[PDB]
Design a protein around this nucleic acid. Structure first.
Lengths: 92, 176, 156, 170, 217
RNA sequence: CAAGGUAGAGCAUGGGCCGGUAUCCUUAAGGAGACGGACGAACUGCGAAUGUGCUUUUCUUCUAUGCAAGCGUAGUGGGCGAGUUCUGGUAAGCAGGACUGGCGAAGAGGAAUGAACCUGGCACUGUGCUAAGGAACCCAAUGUCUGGACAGAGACCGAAAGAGGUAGGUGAAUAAAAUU
């Protein structure tokens, strides 16, 4: 009983936002957007929102770009897709 | 029961208890890494800490390795009550808290007062893990009136470490 | 100073037991092996092809590949404070089937029954775990037949 | 101070009460734990049952009456370990209890032979009449023939300094 | 000459024996181990007395030889040649070593100091432990006080503690006196010089018969 | 569930010391011997404890203020000591290995003093309690009971060998208090 309870707690804490991280950019438009997501996280458990908020804090190199065709390849039949980064053209 | 048994010239000896109580008597700072790991698994960290452990073959072999640091034995109900009432406390995950009705009801859906807690802990074997892992280790004072001999000798040799059997209550009662 | 040949220090190891010299028995050659079995290495000094290096003697590993008269076995080893996998070639005369999985396989046979019923009637298996030996049991004693003990032996 | 206890115990294996015998042992010790220790020691040396296969069913204290503190004569059979070997002997004492007799032996051997109390073993304790006495030491006191005066002075007051003209001792 | 006895007293090193690996070893000084009336039948000399060790150390072949002479001369003068047998039980199998160095040291072509220090054979000793029997006598029962005094003289030739003690055994048999008489009567003993063989109901019957016609009675 | 040949124990192949009854062979010496005692780091017929590896969380117990692939880059590569053990040496505060904690890089209270020993790991304050070690006085806290011991002894301190004095144990005698 207890061993399961413990593991299910660890799995959750591994998803949630840390709240002692902050983006290094001095851009006030970027820092505005982070503030919104931060205030949403402390009022929800939904995994997509937590993932998005963690990714806004990562570096330029961690936010590596994708080409249009690769988005479609990974979209797996969904209608809306979300990406913390820049979308480039595929000439092919 | 004792009357019925004696009235037919027979002796009855009850089953050994499900849990022992352990107290850390002397400093572990120069013990080997194998000893330090064993103390960690029993949740013992500072001098005069006290903790409850399941009586079981694994536990009995762990105790054999650490016997030169710890006093251990069995605890009857009267002393268990004085411990929990005077020095008990608990935790949810990383929050430390006092034992109150709200906190019991939250953690264990059917235990509602501190007296029901003590009753289940003593009489129900199959819930021991959940019931024990809610309590924090007890933080005791050194014994009133001191120790009589060199505490690092075995109890048989006149010190303070080892198996005190039915008589650990006397050590604990001076340390609450 | 010591030397570093392939069979250094193997005077005690790699020698036959008393009254057990000679070639292997038929059972050695008629045993069939399969990928994924656990197997145990014990060198026979009378056979000079397909011998492993003496570090592996008495160790147990898992069969990765099977050939005409030899087997490839996977091992792990610590070198420079890191873990390394090693792939050891051994002839069939130097191996025996390991007993290390025996109890677990019996337990799986019991679990395999319960896990089916757990879908039909319950929802989750009881799963039949082992438990370590508990406290000493209770006893009722008749109290005739008492035996006294005494320091009668003076031990000059 | 020393006390007298009687310990009872049985053998057990993977299952209960594997033998129908019960074993007993009378012992002089300071407490119950030192009593239980002795029971384990004797079982392992006279039989071969180690603790993991034993269970103690009972421990009882044995006590006398002697409301009037009447004085009695006792003889004791003992052995002790030295640097050479084990030494057996017999000695006689006077007192108000078996335990009073036993505490005087333990003190004696520690004084005369430089031995810690755990290296001394009591074999037998017997109460005796005047015709039974063997050795010289106690017979005069047993036959009721002794008086003597006081050799030690005793202080009159707890004060450290007193006037020259006061009485100082007894 | 020789180094003093303190240099080689305790059993510091492992045993080291004359063999293919160790050559150029000198002969031990003791060569003679039995004295007196060697072949006297077991029944004829009942009393047994021993020198016993209360120490663990090495005994030189030079010390063993000096003790032999001491014990023997006394018994021979007092007991008479035909009334006693002495045995020295221990044999000096261990080899001692020396790392020999020059007096005019400080500078030489020879490799000086602790360079290449492993030593050469020097002499031999016997290795001994607690409760061991070092010297043993058998005699007539009249000669107790004589045998005691003979063994006393050995006690001053060896380092450490040793005690003179009297035995329960008959002769150089391993049998207690009480038991020996009980087997002697009832026909169970065969003489083999200084000791006895016991007859048992173990073999073929025609052998049992052939043994029993030879018994001591 | 595997592997191992050390301590102990032994002397059945190989090396190797001393003495043997009957009997046997010759001599009229000696030799062999049905057996006993003594032994090996490179002898083994038997064999521990402690340590090593494999599987199972479908196995107790702990666990997030925790682990952490990958990438970039520092210092270090004269060590020394305690406990347990080993090799060379007459030994050494000597030279050289192995295992578990230290000082290096560790203060505080205690062994009068001391890198490493005993207690025990340090932010900054206040009230209580204990450890190790102490308790006539220097110096915060001391007394009691029972035996020994007379040497400018001991509390701090050396061998083989011994007599004397005194306190006890056990075993032999003798006894017209006892004595040896």
């Amino acid at each position: 009983m207890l061993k399961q309870k413990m593991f299910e707690h660890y799995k959750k804490k591994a998803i949630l936002f840390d709240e002692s991280r902050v983006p290094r950019t001095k851009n006030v438009f970027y820092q505005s957007l982070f503030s919104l997501y931060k205030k949403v996280c402390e009022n929800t458990e939904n995994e997509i929102v937590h993932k998005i908020t963690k990714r806004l804090t990562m570096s330029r190199t961690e936010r590596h770009p994708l080409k249009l065709s690769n988005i479609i390849e990974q979209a797996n039949g969904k209608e809306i897709v979300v990406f913390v980064g820049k979308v480039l053209d595929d000439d092919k | 029961s004792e009357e019925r048994m004696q009235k037919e010239n027979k002796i009855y000896a009850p089953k050994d208890p499900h849990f022992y109580a352990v107290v850390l008597i002397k400093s572990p700072l120069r013990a080997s890494n194998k000893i330090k790991k064993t103390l960690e698994l029993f949740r013992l960290k500072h001098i005069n800490n006290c903790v409850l452990v399941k009586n079981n073959e694994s536990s009995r072999q762990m105790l054999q390795k650490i016997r030169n640091f710890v006093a251990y034995g069995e605890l009857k109900l009267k002393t268990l009550r004085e411990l929990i009432y005077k020095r008990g406390s608990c935790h949810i995950f990383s929050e430390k808290l006092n034992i109150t009705n709200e906190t019991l009801e939250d953690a264990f859906k059917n235990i509602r007062c501190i007296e029901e807690f003590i009753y289940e802990l003593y009489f129900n074997d199959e819930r021991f893990k959940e019931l024990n892992n809610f309590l924090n280790p007890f933080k005791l004072t050194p014994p009133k009136g001191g120790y009589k001999g060199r505490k690092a000798k075995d109890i048989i040799e006149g010190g303070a470490v080892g198996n005190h059997q039915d008589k650990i209550g006397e050590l604990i009662k001076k340390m609450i | 100073v010591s030397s570093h040949g392939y069979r250094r220090q193997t005077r005690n190891l790699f020698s036959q037991a008393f009254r057990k010299h000679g070639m292997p028995n038929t059972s050695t050659y008629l045993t069939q092996y399969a990928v994924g079995e656990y197997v145990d290495i014990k060198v026979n000094p009378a056979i000079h092809k397909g011998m492993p290096h003496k570090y592996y003697h008495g160790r147990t590993g898992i069969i990765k590949e099977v050939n005409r008269g030899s087997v490839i076995v996977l091992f792990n080893r610590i070198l420079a404070n890191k873990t390394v996998e090693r792939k050891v070639i051994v002839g069939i005369e130097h191996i025996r089937k390991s007993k290390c999985q025996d109890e677990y396989l019996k337990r799986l046979e019991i679990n395999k029954k319960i896990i089916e019923e757990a879908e039909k009637k319950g929802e989750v298996p009881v799963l039949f775990k082992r438990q370590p030996k508990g406290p000493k049991p209770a006893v009722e004693m008749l109290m005739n037949n008492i035996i006294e003990l005494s320091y009668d032996k003076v031990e000059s | 101070a020393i006390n007298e206890y009687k310990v009872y115990g049985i053998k057990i294996d993977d299952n209960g009460v594997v033998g129908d015998e019960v074993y007993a042992h009378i012992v002089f010790a300071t407490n119950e734990l030192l009593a239980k220790s002795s029971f384990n020691k004797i079982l392992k040396k006279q039989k071969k049952i180690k603790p993991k296969n034993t269970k103690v069913i009972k421990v009882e204290e044995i006590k006398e009456d002697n409301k009037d503190l009447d004085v009695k004569n006792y003889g004791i059979d003992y052995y002790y370990k030295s640097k050479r070997c084990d030494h057996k002997g017999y000695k006689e004492f006077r007192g108000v209890s078996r335990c009073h007799a036993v505490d005087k032996l333990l003190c004696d051997i520690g004084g005369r032979h430089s031995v810690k109390r755990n290296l001394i073993f009591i074999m037998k304790v017997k109460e005796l009449t005047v015709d039974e006495i063997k050795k010289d030491k106690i017979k005069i006191f047993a036959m009721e023939d002794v008086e003597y005066p006081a050799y030690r002075n005793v202080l009159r007051s707890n004060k450290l300094f007193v006037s020259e003209n006061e009485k100082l001792f007894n | 000459g020789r180094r003093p006895g303190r240099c080689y007293r305790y059993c510091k090193n492992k045993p080291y024996i004359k063999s293919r690996f160790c050559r150029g070893v000198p002969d031990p000084k003791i060569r003679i181990h039995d004295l007196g009336n060697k072949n006297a039948p077991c029944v004829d000399l009942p009393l047994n007395v021993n020198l016993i060790s209360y120490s663990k150390e090495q005994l030189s072949s030079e010390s063993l030889e000096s003790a032999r002479i001491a014990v023997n001369k006394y018994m021979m003068v007092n007991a008479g040649k035909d009334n006693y047998h002495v045995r020295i039980n221990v044999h000096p199998y261990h080899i001692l070593r020396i790392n020999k160095m020059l007096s005019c040291a400080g500078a030489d072509r020879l490799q000086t100091g602790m360079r290449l220090a492993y030593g050469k054979p020097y002499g031999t000793a016997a290795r001994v432990r607690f409760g061991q029997r070092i010297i043993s006598i058998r005699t007539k029962d009249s000669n107790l006080k004589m045998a005691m005094e003979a063994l006393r003289r050995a006690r001053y030739k060896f380092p450490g503690k040793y005690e003179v003690q009297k035995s329960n055994e008959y002769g150089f048999s391993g049998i207690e006196r009480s038991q020996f008489e009980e087997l002697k009567n009832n026909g169970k003993l065969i003489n083999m010089g200084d000791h006895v063989k016991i007859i048992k109901e173990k073999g073929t019957v025609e052998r049992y018969v052939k043994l029993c016609e030879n018994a001591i009675q």
